[PDB]
Amino acid sequence: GIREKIKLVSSAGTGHFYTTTKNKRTKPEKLELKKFDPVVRQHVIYKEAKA
Amino acid sequence: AKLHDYYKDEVVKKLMTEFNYNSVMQVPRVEKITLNMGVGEAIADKKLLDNAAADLAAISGQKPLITKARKSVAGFKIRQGYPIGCKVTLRGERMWEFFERLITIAVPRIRDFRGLSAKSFDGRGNYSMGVREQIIFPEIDYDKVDRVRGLDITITTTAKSDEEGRALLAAFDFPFR
Amino acid sequence: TRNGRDSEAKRLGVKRFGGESVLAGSIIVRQRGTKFHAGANVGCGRDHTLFAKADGKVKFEVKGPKNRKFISIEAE
Amino acid sequence: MDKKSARIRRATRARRKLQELGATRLVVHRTPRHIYAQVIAPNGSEVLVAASTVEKAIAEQLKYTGNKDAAAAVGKAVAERALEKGIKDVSFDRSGFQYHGRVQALADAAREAGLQF
Amino acid sequence: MLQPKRTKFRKMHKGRNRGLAQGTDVSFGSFGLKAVGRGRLTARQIEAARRAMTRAVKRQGKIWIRVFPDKPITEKPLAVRMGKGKGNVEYWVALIQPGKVLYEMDGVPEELAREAFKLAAAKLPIKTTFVTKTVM
Amino acid sequence: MKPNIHPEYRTVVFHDTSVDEYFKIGSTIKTDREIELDGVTYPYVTIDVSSKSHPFYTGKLRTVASEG
RNA sequence: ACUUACCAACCCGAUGCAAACUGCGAAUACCGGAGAAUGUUAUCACGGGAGACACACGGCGGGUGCUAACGUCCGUC
RNA sequence: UCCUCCUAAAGAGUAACGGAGGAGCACGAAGGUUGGCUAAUCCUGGUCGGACAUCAGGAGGUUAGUGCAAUGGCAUAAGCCAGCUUGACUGCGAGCGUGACGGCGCGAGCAGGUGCGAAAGCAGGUCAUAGUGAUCCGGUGGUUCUGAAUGGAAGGGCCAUC
RNA sequence: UGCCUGGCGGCCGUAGCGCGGUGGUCCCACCUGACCCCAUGCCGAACUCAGAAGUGAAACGCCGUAGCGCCGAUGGUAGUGUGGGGUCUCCCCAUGCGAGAGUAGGGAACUGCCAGGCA
Ligand SMILES: [Mg+2]
Ligand SMILES: [Mg+2]
Ligand SMILES: [Mg+2]
Ligand SMILES: [Mg+2]
Ligand SMILES: [Mg+2]
Ligand SMILES: [Mg+2]
Ligand SMILES: [Mg+2]
Ligand SMILES: [Mg+2]
Ligand SMILES: [Mg+2]
Ligand SMILES: [Mg+2]
Ligand SMILES: [Mg+2]
Ligand SMILES: [Mg+2]
Ligand SMILES: [Mg+2]
Ligand SMILES: [Mg+2]
Ligand SMILES: [Mg+2]
Ligand SMILES: [Mg+2]
Numbered sequence: 001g002i003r004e005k006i007k008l009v010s011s012a013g014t015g016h017f018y019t020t021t022k023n024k025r026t027k028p029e030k031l032e033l034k035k036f037d038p039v040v041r042q043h044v045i046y047k048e049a050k051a
Numbered sequence: 052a053k054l055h056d057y058y059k060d061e062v063v064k065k066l067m068t069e070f071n072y073n074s075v076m077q078v079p080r081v082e083k084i085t086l087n088m089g090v091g092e093a094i095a096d097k098k099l100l101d102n103a104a105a106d107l108a109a110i111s112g113q114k115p116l117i118t119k120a121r122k123s124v125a126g127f128k129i130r131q132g133y134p135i136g137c138k139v140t141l142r143g144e145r146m147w148e149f150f151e152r153l154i155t156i157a158v159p160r161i162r163d164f165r166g167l168s169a170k171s172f173d174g175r176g177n178y179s180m181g182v183r184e185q186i187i188f189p190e191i192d193y194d195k196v197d198r199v200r201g202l203d204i205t206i207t208t209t210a211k212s213d214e215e216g217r218a219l220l221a222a223f224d225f226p227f228r
Numbered sequence: 229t230r231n232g233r234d235s236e237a238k239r240l241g242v243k244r245f246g247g248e249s250v251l252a253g254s255i256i257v258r259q260r261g262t263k264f265h266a267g268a269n270v271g272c273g274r275d276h277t278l279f280a281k282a283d284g285k286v287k288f289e290v291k292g293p294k295n296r297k298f299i300s301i302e303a304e
Numbered sequence: 305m306d307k308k309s310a311r312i313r314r315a316t317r318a319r320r321k322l323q324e325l326g327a328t329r330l331v332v333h334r335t336p337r338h339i340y341a342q343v344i345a346p347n348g349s350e351v352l353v354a355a356s357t358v359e360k361a362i363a364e365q366l367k368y369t370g371n372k373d374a375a376a377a378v379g380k381a382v383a384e385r386a387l388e389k390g391i392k393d394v395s396f397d398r399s400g401f402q403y404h405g406r407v408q409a410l411a412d413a414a415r416e417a418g419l420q421f
Numbered sequence: 422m423l424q425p426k427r428t429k430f431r432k433m434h435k436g437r438n439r440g441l442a443q444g445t446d447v448s449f450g451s452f453g454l455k456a457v458g459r460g461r462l463t464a465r466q467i468e469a470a471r472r473a474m475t476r477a478v479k480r481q482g483k484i485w486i487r488v489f490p491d492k493p494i495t496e497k498p499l500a501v502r503m504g505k506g507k508g509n510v511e512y513w514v515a516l517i518q519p520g521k522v523l524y525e526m527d528g529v530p531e532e533l534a535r536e537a538f539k540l541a542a543a544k545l546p547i548k549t550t551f552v553t554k555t556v557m
Numbered sequence: 558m559k560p561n562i563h564p565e566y567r568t569v570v571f572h573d574t575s576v577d578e579y580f581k582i583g584s585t586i587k588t589d590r591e592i593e594l595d596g597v598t599y600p601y602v603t604i605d606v607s608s609k610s611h612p613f614y615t616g617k618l619r620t621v622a623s624e625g
Numbered sequence: 626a627c628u629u630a631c632c633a634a635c636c637c638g639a640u641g642c643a644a645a646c647u648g649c650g651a652a653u654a655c656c657g658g659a660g661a662a663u664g665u666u667a668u669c670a671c672g673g674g675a676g677a678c679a680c681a682c683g684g685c686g687g688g689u690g691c692u693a694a695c696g697u698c699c700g701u702c
Numbered sequence: 703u704c705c706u707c708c709u710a711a712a713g714a715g716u717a718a719c720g721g722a723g724g725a726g727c728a729c730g731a732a733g734g735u736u737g738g739c740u741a742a743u744c745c746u747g748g749u750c751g752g753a754c755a756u757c758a759g760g761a762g763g764u765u766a767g768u769g770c771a772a773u774g775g776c777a778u779a780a781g782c783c784a785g786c787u788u789g790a791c792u793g794c795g796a797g798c799g800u801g802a803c804g805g806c807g808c809g810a811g812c813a814g815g816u817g818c819g820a821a822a823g824c825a826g827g828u829c830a831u832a833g834u835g836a837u838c839c840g841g842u843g844g845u846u847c848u849g850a851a852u853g854g855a856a857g858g859g860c861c862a863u864c
Numbered sequence: 865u866g867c868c869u870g871g872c873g874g875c876c877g878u879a880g881c882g883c884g885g886u887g888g889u890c891c892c893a894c895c896u897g898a899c900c901c902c903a904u905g906c907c908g909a910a911c912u913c914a915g916a917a918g919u920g921a922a923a924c925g926c927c928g929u930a931g932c933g934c935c936g937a938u939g940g941u942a943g944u945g946u947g948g949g950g951u952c953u954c955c956c957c958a959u960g961c962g963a964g965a966g967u968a969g970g971g972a973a974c975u976g977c978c979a980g981g982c983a
Contacts, residue, residue: 136756148583181749200747253797261775
């Protein structure tokens with residue numbers, strides 16, 4: 001409900017992604033969060049993208 | 052600091068012999084002086100508050116805390132958390148230097164001054180008073196004032212009664228009736 | 229305007245009573261708030277379910293200055 | 305909230321958490337003039353070892369009883385006393401004081417001397 | 422005419438009316454009118470009876486009403502199917518159990534209160550009896 | 558008292574008028590110095606309004622009548 | 626700004642009322658441990674075959690209805 | 703369709719075109735952790751200020767507050783700030799609860815890697831309970847799978863997701 | 865061994881509030897000072913540090929004291945399991961369980977480990 005689904009993508013080469021939502025209006029910039037990439041088995045920066 | 056001494060060097064003595072207290076720790080003490088400016092209309096002009104704080108800042112000598120509305124209430128059309136005033140709590144050296152500047156060179160610059168009330172005590176020894184014009188303080192540069200503005204003073208005390216509370220202030224020859 | 233609605237019963241309540249012997253993990257109470265609080269060898273989950281952290285016998289007690297209800301598990 | 309009742313309130317949570325864990329706690333108490341330490345058993349009602357600046361054996365060697373240097377001596381003492389009684393692993397109960405002045409000097413000293421926490 | 426000024430809920434389950442009365446002594450006046458049957462007093466009944474006892478004494482002395490109709494009663498009208506929702510509140514009753522002191526009175530002679538309580542008694546749907554204040 | 562956010566605060570000296578009892582005080586005001594290295598500023602102080610200064614008024618405040 | 630036969634929430638003492646009130650609170654019910662007698666295993670599992678899913682009056686506890694109905698909807702016997 | 707209270711007979715469950723209400727969202731902080739804090743309401747005093755803003759004292763004691771309905775909870779706060787943050791982790795999971803089933807839920811503990819803390823320790827979202835849509839078909843990315851003579855490819859499976 | 869204090873607990877109002885009295889060698893508290901450690905959406909108030917001039921005023925502890933809270937029978941009353949009955953919306957009998965409120969009355973906690981001070 002106005003809250004859009006986005007995917008956070010692994011900054012390593014893997015194509016691993018977490019999925020979440022965003023109020024794309026009030027918080028229009030790209031969400032960037034450290035999370036665990038299970039393919040390299042290490043925590044890596046993840047950066048917002050479209051779904 | 053001079054007036055802290057007059058408290059120690061001179062006031063205690065006066066009060067002990069006045070009320071015949073058994074322990075010197077019963078003698079009323081000035082605990083703190085809290086300055087407040089009820090702004091009320093920054094809700095319309097966000098900038099009216101900034102100039103009030105800086106008025107207090109030069110008056111008190113420390114950065115004021117700006118007080119938010121504890122509670123939204125539509126009577127004054129204010130939403131909770133709206134900045135609606137600013138305050139300063141003075142203690143120690145700074146409180147005493149203010150206490151002096153107040154009597155020695157502000158109250159005299161009140162327009163047609165004739166003395167302060169002696170009945171503005173809250174009933175448990177604390178005295179509160181208003182000023183209409185912050186221009187009585189010489190830290191205020193009459194040319195720069197954006198606007199004349201007033202001010203709450205409360206002297207919180209450790210007297211249990213007003214009779215005791217008044218003697219403490221009286222003992223500084225605090226101007227009354 | 230108009231009534232006629234309700235929701236499913238959540239089948240809450242005490243699941244093992246005083247004395248019942250349980251293996252660790254067994255839910256002892258389903259509750260909304262903490263009517264019973266977790267005591268020794270008892271865990272509290274996010275919906276305030278109290279569960280066993282050890283094999284033993286269920287023990288209800290009342291403890292403390294607020295007279296709160298506590299569940300613990302005694303080894304048997 | 306009145307200094308004392310406020311500190312105790314600040315302390316209650318960590319102690320219940322500690323009770324649940326069954327830790328033997330190294331409990332510190334601070335006062336402007338003195339500092340005190342008790343190693344207390346998990347039941348909460350029997351003290352296994354103790355040291356403080358209130359015992360003459362300790363204060364004799366101290367400039368002023370209420371400062372950081374003295375607290376460091378108390379820390380060193382409980383640690384030693386506890387190890388002679390076979391005690392090694394404990395948990396620290398700062399008891400509502402900040403972990404910081406004197407209190408932090410005392411812990412460091414118990415740690416300097418082999419007490420495990 | 423008595424009625425709750427406001428209530429938490431509009432309507433109330435029918436419920437039942439077993440039990441003995443509470444508030445069984447003349448606790449305000451000198452004399453009382455006491456319930457012997459179980460049942461319902463309507464707000465209008467309390468009134469028909471209140472007027473009469475007050476007529477009867479020529480508005481002398483003092484009167485207390487110990488009951489209050491806080492129970493909403495509904496009814497379904499003519500030409501209505503069962504169901505389709507609970508009836509509408511039409512009137513209010515107080516539930517009466519044997520022993521309830523209904524009215525008290527004082528400031529008048531024993532003889533006159535009895536006449537007055539007798540006159541009201543004719544307005545009520547439950548048997549009553551005449552009582553007096555008692556030490557202990 | 559919190560580093561790096563307050564208003565200077567010096568020990569200023571205050572000069573009065575037809576009376577030679579300056580005072581020195583905290584205050585934040587700005588002026589220009591002298592004796593042992595302070596401030597200055599000529600007002601009309603406590604020992605001046607005629608309910609502090611008790612009587613003697615005259616001065617350059619105001620009057621109450623002339624003659625008679 | 627003073628005052629009135631007026632009307633007055635709060636608070637105090639006195640008295641009722643509550644399914645969606647509780648600073649109290651049973652009888653029964655239910656869950657669990659042990660134990661004997663008794664009981665054609667009455668219990669449990671899997672497996673073959675089903676039927677049945679219009680219910681009725683009475684009793685107790687109730688909602689609804691008028692504490693109306695050979696009324697109507699639940700629980701229990 | 704879903705949540706909360708009552709009916710509901712002191713375990714669970716329990717009907718009605720019975721009685722009240724509410725959801726189909728929200729939040730990168732309003733999540734995590736460490737440290738810290740304690741409401742509402744009245745009286746008295748106080749510039750402009752008023753029945754009610756901000757300041758002070760006393761009384762009070764949670765009647766406040768909780769992103770929102772109700773109930774249940776909450777001071778050790780779950781209520782209010784601040785700093786550092788990404789555990790709003792990936793793989794699993796003893797043992798339970800609840801369901802005709804499909805499913806739903808609670809869950810210590812193990813592995814890997816992580817945040818906060820001196821530390822004991824906490825964290826697998828939010829005080830809990832609503833905030834939702836099976837299958838098919840199909841889109842997108844990944845892939846030691848499969849690849850109709852053979853090597854590829856297309857299609858398919860597998861993981862993620864729309 | 866005793867009285868006093870402090871710290872950690874058991875119990876969780878018979879344990880609390882009040883009202884009165886009371887103690888400072890030690891403890892404890894207010895306290896003194898603060899550049900600094902460290903802190904204040906401002907304030908050395910609180911946090912915190914260095915201290916020991918003063919005080920038991922506040923607070924705290926102890927003693928008392930029934931104004932409250934709190935506790936609380938006996939008897940009776942309510943209800944209710946089974947069986948039976950009536951004038952069956954409610955009631956009664958036998959038997960078992962047996963409240964709540966209220967009354968008498970209790971009540972100014974009791975207690976463990978450790979440590980210090982006096983005797
Ligand atoms: Mg079968
Ligand atoms: Mg059918
Ligand atoms: Mg059927
Ligand atoms: Mg049927
Ligand atoms: Mg029928
Ligand atoms: Mg039930
Ligand atoms: Mg039941
Ligand atoms: Mg905390
Ligand atoms: Mg006011
Ligand atoms: Mg670390
Ligand atoms: Mg929250
Ligand atoms: Mg081919
Ligand atoms: Mg091929
Ligand atoms: Mg201090
Ligand atoms: Mg005292
Ligand atoms: Mg009783």
